[PDB]
C-alpha cells in the first residue's frame, strides 16, 4: 500500500502513526533492495545530497519542499537518519517509501546513528518500543545493516557519512565490505561512518568522540589525487550555514537539520550536482 503510506506520510510535531505491519513491510522491502544494489554506489549527475536528519520530519519534509518531492529530484542522503528528534519513526519510513517507491533514483547511505547500540541510546529504541515494540526497531536493525557505505558520483564526488579512514588504499576495500553487517568499533567501516576533518591536525589524530580519527588537509588532498577525484562530500558535523569547506574546497561537510536538536541555531543545506558537475547550495534557515 505504497501510495497510501507515501500520502498519510505527507497529509501532515503532528505524528504519522502508520501501521505495524506497513512499517515491517517498508523495512523488508528496502532491505532487500539494498542487498541487491552495490554497497559502493556509482551514480550521476544531476543529483541532490542532503546531510543529517535525526529525526527532524518537519525539516525532512521542508527539504523535499526545495528541493522537489520525488521523482521531481534525485536523493542521495548520507546518513543519521533516527535519534535526537521527536520523529525519527515518520523520517526513516518515508526515506525507506521513497526508496522502494524510485529504487534507482532514490538513494541512502548508511549514518553511524544507523546502528543499534547508538541507537539505543540516542532516542530511537525508545520512541519504537513507546510508539510500537522492540521487535519493530530490531526489524530496523536488520535493514539498516544492509545499507551502503558510500557512493561516487560520476567517478568525481566521493561521499559518504564520516570520512577518510588511515586503512582506506583502495575502492575495492569498501566493496569488499560484507552485508549484513553490525558497525565495528575500529577500521575501516568505522572510520566511513564516524572519521571527522580538522584544520588543526596534521595527518592522522586522536578524535573527541573516542571513535576513528581527524584527518588533516593534505590527508584530503593526497586521497583525491590518488584516486582521481574532485571533492570529498560528507555530513556528520553539525556547521553554522549547513554546508562548510575544508581543505581549500576539496572537502564539504553537508547537514540538513536547520536549528539542530534545538540547541543549535544553524540553518540545513542541500547540495546540487548538475550533469556538468557543477555544485550549488540550497539553504533552508532554522
Ligand atoms: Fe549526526
Ligand atoms: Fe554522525
Not at 554546508?243 to 539542530?260: D, G, I, W
Given at each position: 500500500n505504497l501510495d497510501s503510506i507515501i500520502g498519510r506520510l505527507l497529509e501532515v510535531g503532528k505524528n504519522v502513526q502508520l501501521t505495524e505491519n506497513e512499517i515491517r513491510g517498508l523495512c523488508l522491502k528496502s532491505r532487500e533492495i539494498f542487498l541487491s544494489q552495490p554497497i559502493l554506489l556509482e551514480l550521476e549527475a544531476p543529483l541532490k545530497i542532503c546531510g543529517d536528519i535525526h529525526g527532524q520530519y518537519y525539516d525532512l519534509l521542508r527539504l523535499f519542499e526545495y528541493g522537489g518531492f520525488p521523482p521531481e529530484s534525485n536523493y542521495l542522503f548520507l546518513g543519521?537518519?533516527?535519534?535526537?528528534?521527536?520523529?525519527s519513526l515518520e523520517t526513516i519510513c518515508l526515506l525507506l517509501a521513497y526508496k522502494i517507491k524510485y529504487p534507482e533514483n532514490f538513494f541512502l547511505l548508511r549514518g553511524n546513528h544507523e546502528c543499534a547500540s547508538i541507537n539505543r541510546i540516542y532516542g530511537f529504541y525508545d520512541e519504537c518500543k513507546r510508539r510500537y515494540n522492540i521487535k519493530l526497531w530490531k526489524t530496523f536493525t536488520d535493514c539498516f545493516n544492509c545499507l551502503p557505505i558510500a557512493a561516487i558520483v560520476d567517478e568525481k564526488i566521493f561521499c559518504c557519512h564520516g570520512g577518510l579512514s588511515?586503512?582506506?588504499?583502495?575502492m575495492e576495500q569498501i566493496r569488499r565490505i560484507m552485508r549484513p553487517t553490525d558497525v565495528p568499533d575500529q577500521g575501516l567501516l568505522c572510520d566511513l561512518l564516524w572519521s571527522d576533518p580538522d584544520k588543526?591536525?596534521?595527518?592522522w589524530g586522536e578524535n573527541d568522540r573516542g571513535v576513528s580519527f581527524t584527518f588533516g588537509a593534505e590527508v584530503v588532498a593526497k586521497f583525491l589525487h590518488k584516486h582521481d577525484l574532485d571533492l570529498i562530500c560528507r555530513a556528520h558535523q553539525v556547521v553554522e550555514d549547513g554546508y562548510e569547506f575544508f581543505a581549500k574546497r576539496q572537502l564539504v561537510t553537508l547537514f540538513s537539520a536547520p536549528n539542530y536538536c534545538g540547541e543549535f541555531d544553524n540553518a540545513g543545506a542541500m547540495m546540487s550536482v548538475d550533469e556538468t558537475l557543477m555544485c550549488s547550495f540550497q539553504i533552508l534557515k532554522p
Amino acid at each position: 500500500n505504497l501510495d497510501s503510506i507515501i500520502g498519510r506520510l505527507l497529509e501532515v510535531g503532528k505524528n504519522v502513526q502508520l501501521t505495524e505491519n506497513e512499517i515491517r513491510g517498508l523495512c523488508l522491502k528496502s532491505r532487500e533492495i539494498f542487498l541487491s544494489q552495490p554497497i559502493l554506489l556509482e551514480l550521476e549527475a544531476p543529483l541532490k545530497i542532503c546531510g543529517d536528519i535525526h529525526g527532524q520530519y518537519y525539516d525532512l519534509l521542508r527539504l523535499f519542499e526545495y528541493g522537489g518531492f520525488p521523482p521531481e529530484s534525485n536523493y542521495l542522503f548520507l546518513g543519521d537518519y533516527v535519534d535526537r528528534g521527536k520523529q525519527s519513526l515518520e523520517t526513516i519510513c518515508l526515506l525507506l517509501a521513497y526508496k522502494i517507491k524510485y529504487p534507482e533514483n532514490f538513494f541512502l547511505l548508511r549514518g553511524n546513528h544507523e546502528c543499534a547500540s547508538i541507537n539505543r541510546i540516542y532516542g530511537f529504541y525508545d520512541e519504537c518500543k513507546r510508539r510500537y515494540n522492540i521487535k519493530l526497531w530490531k526489524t530496523f536493525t536488520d535493514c539498516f545493516n544492509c545499507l551502503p557505505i558510500a557512493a561516487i558520483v560520476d567517478e568525481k564526488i566521493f561521499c559518504c557519512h564520516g570520512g577518510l579512514s588511515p586503512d582506506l588504499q583502495s575502492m575495492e576495500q569498501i566493496r569488499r565490505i560484507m552485508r549484513p553487517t553490525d558497525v565495528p568499533d575500529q577500521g575501516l567501516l568505522c572510520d566511513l561512518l564516524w572519521s571527522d576533518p580538522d584544520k588543526d591536525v596534521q595527518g592522522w589524530g586522536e578524535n573527541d568522540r573516542g571513535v576513528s580519527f581527524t584527518f588533516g588537509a593534505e590527508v584530503v588532498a593526497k586521497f583525491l589525487h590518488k584516486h582521481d577525484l574532485d571533492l570529498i562530500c560528507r555530513a556528520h558535523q553539525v556547521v553554522e550555514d549547513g554546508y562548510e569547506f575544508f581543505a581549500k574546497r576539496q572537502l564539504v561537510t553537508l547537514f540538513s537539520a536547520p536549528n539542530y536538536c534545538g540547541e543549535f541555531d544553524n540553518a540545513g543545506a542541500m547540495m546540487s550536482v548538475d550533469e556538468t558537475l557543477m555544485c550549488s547550495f540550497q539553504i533552508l534557515k532554522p
